Amino acid sequence: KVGLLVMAYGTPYKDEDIERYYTDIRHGHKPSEEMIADLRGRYHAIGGLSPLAKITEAQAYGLEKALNDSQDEVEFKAYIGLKHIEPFIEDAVEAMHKDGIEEAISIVLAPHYSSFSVEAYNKRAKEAADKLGGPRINAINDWYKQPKFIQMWADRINETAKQIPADELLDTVLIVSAHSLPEKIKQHNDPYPNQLQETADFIFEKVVVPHYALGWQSEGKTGEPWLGPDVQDLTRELYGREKYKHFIYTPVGFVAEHLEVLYDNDYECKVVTDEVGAAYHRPPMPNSDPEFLEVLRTVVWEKYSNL
Ligand SMILES: CC1=C(CCC(=O)O)c2cc3nc(cc4[nH]c(cc5[nH]c(cc1n2)c(C)c5CCC(=O)O)c(CCC(=O)O)c4C)C(CCC(=O)O)=C3C
Ligand SMILES: [Cl-]
Ligand SMILES: [Fe+2]
């Protein structure tokens, strides 16, 4: 009945895909052999390829089932629309149209909104809808305010923090982060940095960890300022000022274990904590955990109810 357009970045299915994938990320402008080798190396450092493709499938169809098992007002049919590899956003909308789906709710697998992320997802999805003639795309822009989302993260952080000696929890700090973007989005009151601060604040309101700070990660290869501080620079800064013994990294901008977590956090950030002599913690990402599917099920239903 109702189309469930679940959108995410996408990831190379094969080592042979890294090239066209990176090209699509660079809006067609093919990267150099050096850029490709750096990216391929990062993928190999996390075991070869990312599990994002399978986690994304599990989230998309785990969400479809969660919605369908919880009510019978409508039947949701989930179509996956990736940003930089097939099936693309336009392919998903094409499938919805050919399948007779005339109404759909779209959600990005990223809780926060920004001109670079969700807006691009929604523009492409809605423009594909306009051209094909359907379906009608009712887009969710953000859902970080979903109480179950905040609680999910607080629980994970609390699960980890209660593994920290009480006499060292005062020396523990929570690093909330998301994918960095060009700092210029802050010049036009882009909500992204604020949604992250709000998310960090909400989660801090509900965890035992007494210290927290908002960082950014995965800044791109460009020649303009990107949002900071970077989680690595932040870790250094915080150890210098407070000598924290435990760093709990929650890249709440992401919803799955993928390259931007398995490398930029589990490697690059751990390198810094190893350096300063502090402990590294990175709670499990939501992936397709039942409570996260419940978060998405709640977000999508509240959206449908408001249609
Ligand atoms: C806001 C945002 C999200 C969060 C929202 C969302 O989920 O959409 C996100 C997620 C992801 N980004 C990812 C991967 C990459 N992003 C890149 C590059 C870039 N991302 C950007 C932005 C974002 N990205 C930007 C503005 C660039 C620079 C483009 C340019 O300079 O032209 C590059 C190129 C190399 C590099 O710059 O590091 C890669 C490989 C993966 C998949 C990881 C895997 O494969 O497991 C995921 C989930
Ligand atoms: Cl992008
Ligand atoms: Fe990206």
Residue numbers in the entry: 4 to 310
Article, verbatim:
Best statistics were obtained when the ferrous iron was placed into the density with an occupancy of 24%. Ring A with the substituent p2 exhibits the highest distortion in the “34% Fe” structure (+12.6°), +9.2° in the cpIII structure and lowered values for the “24% Fe” (+4.8°), and the “68% Fe” (+1.9°) structures; in ring B (p4) the angle is altered the most in the analyzed samples (−13.4°, −10.5°, −11.4°, and −6.7°) as a function of the site occupancy by Fe ions, exhibiting a high degree of distortion compared to the coproheme structure. The measured change of angles throughout the ferrous iron insertion process at the site of p7 at pyrrole ring D is also peculiar: the rings in the substrate‐ and product‐bound states overlap well for all structures besides the “24% Fe” structure (−2.1° in the cpIII‐structure, −1.6° in the "68% Fe" structure, and −1.4° in the "34% Fe" structure). Interestingly, in the “24% Fe” structure ring D is significantly more tilted (−4.2°). In the “24% iron occupancy” and in the coproheme‐bound structures, the guanidinium group points toward p7, while in the “68% iron occupancy” structure, being in a split conformation, partially points outwards since one conformation is 5.4 Å from p7. The residue points toward p7 in the “24% Fe”, “34% Fe”, and in the coproheme‐complex structures, but points away (5.4 Å) in the “68% Fe” structure. Nevertheless, a definitive conclusion cannot be drawn as the ionic radius of the ferrous iron in the “24% Fe”, “34% Fe”, and “68% Fe” structures is larger than the ionic radius of the ferric ion in the coproheme product and would result in an out‐of‐plane position regardless of the side from which it is approaching.
Coproporphyrin ferrochelatase (CpfC) in the CPD heme biosynthesis pathway incorporates ferrous iron into coproporphyrin III (cpIII) to give coproheme, which is eventually decarboxylated to yield heme b by the coproheme decarboxylase enzyme in the final step of this biosynthetic process (Dailey et al., 2017; Dailey & Gerdes, 2015; Layer, 2021). Understanding structure–function relationships of key enzymes, such as ferrochelatase, is an essential precondition for the design of new inhibitors for antibiotic‐resistant pathogens, like Listeria monocytogenes. LmCpfC crystals in complex with cpIII were soaked with a ferrous iron solution and flash‐vitrified after 2, 3, and 4 min, to obtain snapshots of the enzymatic reaction during iron insertion into the porphyrin macrocycle. We report three crystal structures showing different iron content during metalation in LmCpfC, identifying the presence and defining the extent of the porphyrin distortions during iron insertion.
